[model samples]
Target: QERPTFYRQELNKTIWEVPERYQNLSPVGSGAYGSVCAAFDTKTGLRVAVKKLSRPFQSIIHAKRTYRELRLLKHMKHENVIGLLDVFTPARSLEEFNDVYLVTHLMGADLNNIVTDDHVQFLIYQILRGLKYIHSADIIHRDLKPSNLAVNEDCELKILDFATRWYRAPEIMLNAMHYNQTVDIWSVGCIMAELLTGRTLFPGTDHIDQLKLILRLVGTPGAELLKKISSESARNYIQSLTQMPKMNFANVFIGANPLAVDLLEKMLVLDSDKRITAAQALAHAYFAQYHDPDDEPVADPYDQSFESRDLLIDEWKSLTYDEVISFVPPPL
Candidate 1:
């Protein structure tokens, strides 16, 4: 008879279908999507954050994302990016494997706090540092925001998630084709603005309303730029509007540092082509105190072949299982 690879454990009134190698499970964050806990890894004698995917196989989307996130994290190795230490599931058989757990370095909080300009500058710099690496791999975070970022007390930040409507770029809202890394830059700008202002830059009631808010702050999109919109109605709607003047950043964001405002101006432009690239953003003067080219490393271009393939859940299970089982965790 075959046996299971993991044992069922309970914590905080919830079941943790995990490997015995981890112990002392305590709550980190509880949610319907994923629940995290702090645990000790007996194999490494280290503390780790264990994330349990809630009903991973319940939907194709969830399973696919869980697989992709694991693969992406597996491919990456960076100080600013969250490193995946291990992946495990309770099921011994393919059909029985429903729960997925990702173990990573324990983080104190995520995009969760800030203070002093020094805090703002250093935190933002680390974000771009990691972003530079991600964009180098031809990957756009798609979801770059405060909450998605994990920050330790030291202010180290990690790039995390894309369903975020608040930090979304105008090009995406306008249905532009083949989005680029600059899309991530716009989010960085929105996030920076929020960090400084304590409010969302373009708080819209809906997608259409968002474009209006974007236009209001950055000025009306020019005819040439409006032509870039792929949607006919969306293009015409923007083109027909009375042009709004772009607000002066220093004036609007009064009492903010000039270098900070200057960088934000470079990031929040309506034209995707004109936005600052992550590499360039890192080199901006605002981060001169913290910028180090040696420390800002780039990742090799990621292979998207797996993403392009559409396979059944079993295949995904096989692929994910192979990835986890084959992994040889480095000495801690």
Candidate 2:
């Protein structure tokens, strides 16, 4: 099949001329970024998910996010992390470039649509697996939410939106300048609870409300823990709030196995230092059958070229667009 030649003006007008190799285009989902369409890739003979990023350069911050996402997606390679198959732009010249498209494996659905108690074990294990890989590479997936997880009928799961937010950790919500991968561990707990209850564990209307919701379930931080918090304002704010008692896991995770509830408790720890690591979570009794190291081979080291600090918005936009224009599909 001949690869379609794309034009910036045409793509901007609502008519999307994707590569001819991709056929049977249909809308899969849409978000603030852009709409995702499922397409049949004739060359690979596999269905692929193509995300057309919405006006990525609209703002410096948004542009930086686009850059961060593109770079991380390219570097992450694992069974549990969404693999970047290809990237393209309709603009022939840098001046004409306005749209960015990312190609990834097509999956049955996001966890947000299909999560249930029946899927708790398999889903969380995969989330941890992908997370372990990312953390091993020294990267943090700041955004770990149900909607960002892709799952297939075979129970295969992959983490997506590696650099975005909204499933942000308590430290981030508190405006802490320095945080770690444990933030993602907190998100894992939220996802686990949602899978069991079929609703957001902390459905906060705003940042303060989100913190309050978390405290409501996990209880307010103690004095020792409060001292560990770097943000003085955040610490004072937390101290001022009414202290709440921690909810019993068995009650919150009703009908769930005791082991599963225990695991959930570990992930939802209010203090980041006390939160369970992905490696530790994988070894928990809740996932005994699924996470055996002997059964799964060690993953190869991830590409580290994308490891760098977030820079000025213009610099981020430039670096990201350069990669888009020069991208070569990785070998399957």
Candidate 3:
């Protein structure tokens, strides 16, 4: 008879359940992947978000995604990156399990809801600061969409969303031979532009449409840049597009911090190899007021060996549950 060490509480005697420490379970939001509930932790007297992921093993891809998120979120430790505070499953035994409740500090509005100028600097600095830490671990957060960027009423920000969406780098979009951490840099630039103008920098409808929008701003990538793409179709599609000149940043951003605009210019460069690095971006003059060399810390690269192992559904559940049992909460 296997039993979990932690205390458990059932909700409404229904299938939906969680730990007793979490009180006042109220729905916050729902998505295709999972449902989120805002709850207060009676033990710590804190507010937190609880995400219930059901039937994670129904698809191999989804199970793997859940595994990746659990490990990475647990590994990441930075003020700007969202932290995984705890995890739970209601099932009495291994065969009965399917859901894992992921808990994090409750966040208010996302970047999409907030629009401003001066606030952009601190926001971007935190992103770069947080990104620097992730890059140190040899991980690139592919999705840095505004919706993933959570901010409170006071504008404290955390970089979340490991899932992919918009903000693709030129190399990723064109299927280049090799892409590096700079892919994330491109996302930050797009987000900064959105903050400056309160409009999507590139509101693309489809894959080809995305390229056209990006090309209009970065200018038609010269023949040299096109050679980087490994995808023959992608190269051909871009080569045939109408020639467009790179728009002047100052004119495009219009009245944003000159330093901020200059930094964005470097970040949005079409050549992935030439884009500004997270470390370099944080050191720019734009962040002179907040840049502290001692404050920034690099981490050991994540040992991704476990991710390579193709485990069965039951094995994933056992291993993931081990992580849940041993996790130590960060100090508030």
Candidate 4:
């Protein structure tokens, strides 16, 4: 098969084109930046995913970042990592800025879809394996949540999204960078808590609300922890809210698995500095029953670069802020 193109021939792609590759195309997942389509590749008889980036986020910096992500994806050959199939960069034919599209292997359903207690064991195991490999490669998936975990029909897990990674302790985060791969550890713990309880471990509606939720649930962060966030109002709120006593996960999941509770407490600690590393997390009791497994590798089939995306107002639809979380589940 010919390698997929690197840049978008058209800037704003439509759901209509989804059938060019797949017989049927349907909108599946979306985020603050873009929407993803669940597609099938007819030529190879394979399922693929297409992520359409929005124009508002288009910039040279973002473009370069997208390129960097694709590069990293190409080099990342792992069963636990999401595979990048192709990318469509913005072309000059569009307006000031246009949408960018990324084609990759489809993650059947996010880890959040697994709400039943029946699938918790396999889900936790796969998550640990994926995270361990990511950390071992010296990479930090800054945002690690059930929403970011992709699970295939076979119950295999793949970690997606790496826009906020930290490598070698960049000088920009000098004062605030207290943890490394440990951030992922916190996310894993969060996911585990959600799995055991079938609720979002930290359910916050907005950025501020989420911060408060984190502080409230995990015990307040100290003055040092507040210094990293860019919002001043947030810092003040944390200062006012941090005085509460600590809350242990054991108490929250008292009737649930004791091992899961232990792992949660260690991961969601007040002091991020003490959070477990990926290696240490693998050794944690929650994953005692895990069986390290390997999967048959797959390839990308779409030419995201050739996929035409024009910047047309008719193709875009605006949504109210409240509608943002409508598609988001409570988390498993």
* TM-score, structure 2 vs. true: 0.81
1 versus 2: better lDDT goes to: 1
Where's the lowest-lDDT run of ten residues in candidate 4? 317-326
The 10-residue segment of model 1 with minimum total lDDT is: 1-10
Candidate 4 yields a Cα-based lDDT of: 0.56
Q: In model 2, which regions exceed 4 Å deviation?
A: 1-12, 27-32, 56-63, 90-99, 115-118, 163-167, 205-209, 294-318
Candidate 2, residue 7: how far the Cα is off, in Å: 8.9
Highest lDDT scorer: 3
Model 2: per-residue Cα lDDT over 1-332, one tens digit each = 33455422233245565777777777777788888888888888989998889888888778877887787788777788888999887666677777788898887688866624546898899999888888887888787887888888887888976632446778877777678889999889888877777777888887777778878888877898766744888888888888999888879778877887898889888678789999888998888778787643334565555445656766766788798866777775
Error of 4 at 54 (Å): 6.5
Per-candidate Cα lDDT values, in order, are: 0.80, 0.78, 0.81, 0.56
Ranking by TM-score: 3, 1, 2, 4
Off by over 4 Å in 4: 1-39, 50-58, 86-102, 115-118, 163-179, 205-213, 220-242, 291-332
lDDT of 1 by residue, 117-227 (tens): 777898889888888888888877786777889897777787654255888777777777656888889988998887888778888898878887888889987778877
Score candidate 1 by TM-score against the native. 0.89
What is the lDDT for 104 in model 2? 89
Give per-residue CA lDDT, model 4, range 129-182, as digits (tens).
Answer: 766666665666777766678887778888887632211121122234345666
- Arranged by lDDT, best first: 3, 1, 2, 4
Better of 3 and 4 by lDDT: 3
